[PDB]
Structures are given as C-alpha cells and as structure tokens.
From a paper:
DsbA from E. coli K−12 (EcDsbA) was the first and is probably the best-characterised DSB enzyme to date. This 21 kDa periplasmic protein is a dithiol oxidase that catalyses disulphide bond formation between consecutive cysteines of unfolded polypeptides as they are translocated to the periplasm. EcDsbA consists of a canonical TRX domain, a hallmark of proteins involved in redox homeostasis, with an inserted helical domain. The TRX domain harbours the conserved active site CXXC (C30-P31-H32-C33 in EcDsbA) that is featured in many proteins of the TRX superfamily. The acidity of this groove originates from a cluster of negatively charged residues (E24, E37, E38, D44, E85, D86 and E94) that map along a buried channel in the interface between the TRX and helical domains of EcDsbA.
The other three mutants, E37A, E24A and E24A/E37A/K58A, were crystallised in space groups P21, P212121 and P2, respectively, with four molecules per asymmetric unit. In this structure, the K58 side chain shifts towards the E24-vacated space, and this change disrupts the proposed salt bridge between K58 and E37. The latter salt bridge was also abolished in the E37A mutant. The hydrogen bond between E37 and water w3 was removed in the E37A mutant structure which has the effect of shortening the distance between w1 and w3 from 3.7 Å in the wildtype structure to 3.3 Å in the mutant structure. Furthermore, the E37A mutation abolished the interaction of E37 with bulk water. Overall, in the E24A and E37A structures, although water molecules w1, w2 and w3 were still present and coordinated to the remaining charged residues in the channel, the number of interactions stabilising these water molecules was reduced, with the E37A mutant also resulting in the water network being less tightly connected to the bulk water (bw1/bw2). E37A caused the most dramatic decrease in the initial rate among single mutants, which was 6-fold slower than that of the wildtype. In agreement with PilQ and ASST peptide oxidation assays, E37A caused the most significant effect among the single mutants, whereby it catalysed PapD peptide oxidation with a rate constant of 1.68 ± 0.12 × 106 M−1 s −1, which is ~26% slower than the wildtype EcDsbA. To investigate whether the water network had been altered upon the introduction of the alanine mutations, we inspected the DsbA alanine mutant crystal structures, which showed that although all point mutants maintained some of the w1–w4 molecules, their position was altered and the tight connectivity of waters to stabilising charged amino acids was considerably reduced. This was especially the case for E37A, which lacked the negatively charged side chain stabilising the buried water network and connecting it with the bulk solvent, which could contribute to initiation of the proton relay. We also found that this mutant showed the lowest oxidase activity of all the single mutants we analysed.
Residue numbers in the entry: 1 to 188
Write the structure that this text describes.
C-alpha cells in the first residue's frame, strides 16, 4: 500500500513506553534541523495535520556543539518550561548557524531577553529544578530511542520517520508527504 514499513517510516525493534505521541529531536547546530525548521517548516506543517487531540513535542539533543550544545539543551528546557518555544526557535537557529553570534551562555540569554523573556525570569528558570528535570527528560528520551542523529521524529514511541524514502525534488511535496506520514502513523 501507499504507506509501507521501510519506506516512509521504520519500526523501532524495541518500542518506548510512555513516549510522547509525536516526538521530534533536533539540534540548533544541525544544518538539516535548520532546513527542517526554517525552510521546510516541518514541525508547523506536521502540527497542522495532526488528528484531534494528538500533540507534538520537540526535544533538543547534545551530541552536537560541545559545551555550548549542552547550554542550548538547557535553554530549550527553559523555553519548554516558560512556553516560549515559538518565540525563540528562529533567533536561536539563526544566531547559531546564520550569523554565528551565539557563542556563549550569555548570548543565548540575550535571545530570550530580546524575545520578551525578562532576565530575572530567565535566570530563575535556568537554575530551577523544573529545568533540570526537563534536561534529564530530553536526554532520557533520546537514549530510549537509541538516537544516533538528528533531525528525527518518532510516533507513539514505535515508528520512526524515514524522510530518505520520500520525494525531495519538490520541497512542498516533501513536506506534504512527511506530514501525511505523521498523520497516518498517529492513527495506527
């Protein structure tokens, strides 16, 4: 049929219990993740097609970018904790990869400030137990899917998206096929 194991998706040989329904891993240092978020808008388009009541989650990973990468995973935990993922995603991607103006923890904080998150609020979150828990949560999730690279997306901790099996000659077609696969898997 249209959808086929090994084509638009693969099946984890050891599924993850309690995983988020739709789980994307990315790194602000990853060029393909920059392509996913800034040119393809994968996550916005996936969200648009998700069935009623199925929600999507993004976690940041550390195996890219060294110490700054660890800071960016903690900053993303701040963004989840504060609900500002959509305020900071673009200036964090561009600051790391486009202008290369993000080179320290302080530079990341400046992005949150300029996006409306006051400094005292950012520091409180940065040093909070909630954020520590969210860092550990992101790391545990990637380990549980034996994550080896990004970007990556998993549905119900069972199925892994396989973009290499999709048509890449037209980006809008690729995005449509990617999002329709997430829709199909979420209903499976």
């Amino acid at each position: 049929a249209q959808y086929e194991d090994g084509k638009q998706y693969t099946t984890l040989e050891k599924p993850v219990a309690g995983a988020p329904q739709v789980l994307e891993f990315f790194s602000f240092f990853c060029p393909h993740c920059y392509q996913f978020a800034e040119v393809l808008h994968i996550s916005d388009n996936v969200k648009k097609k998700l069935p009623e009541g199925v929600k999507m989650t993004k976690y940041h990973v550390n195996f890219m970018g060294g110490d700054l990468g660890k800071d960016l995973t903690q900053a993303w935990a701040v963004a989840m904790a504060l609900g500002v993922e959509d305020k900071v995603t673009v200036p964090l991607f561009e600051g790391v990869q486009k202008t290369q103006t993000i080179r320290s923890a302080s530079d990341i904080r400046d992005v949150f400030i300029n996006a409306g998150i006051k400094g005292e609020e950012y520091d409180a979150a940065w040093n909070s137990f909630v954020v520590k828990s969210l860092v550990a949560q992101q790391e545990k999730a990637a380990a549980d899917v034996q994550l080896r690279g990004v970007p990556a997306m998993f549905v119900n901790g069972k199925y892994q998206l396989n973009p290499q099996g999709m048509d890449t000659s037209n980006m809008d077609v690729f995005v449509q096929q990617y999002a329709d696969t997430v829709k199909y898997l979420s209903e499976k």
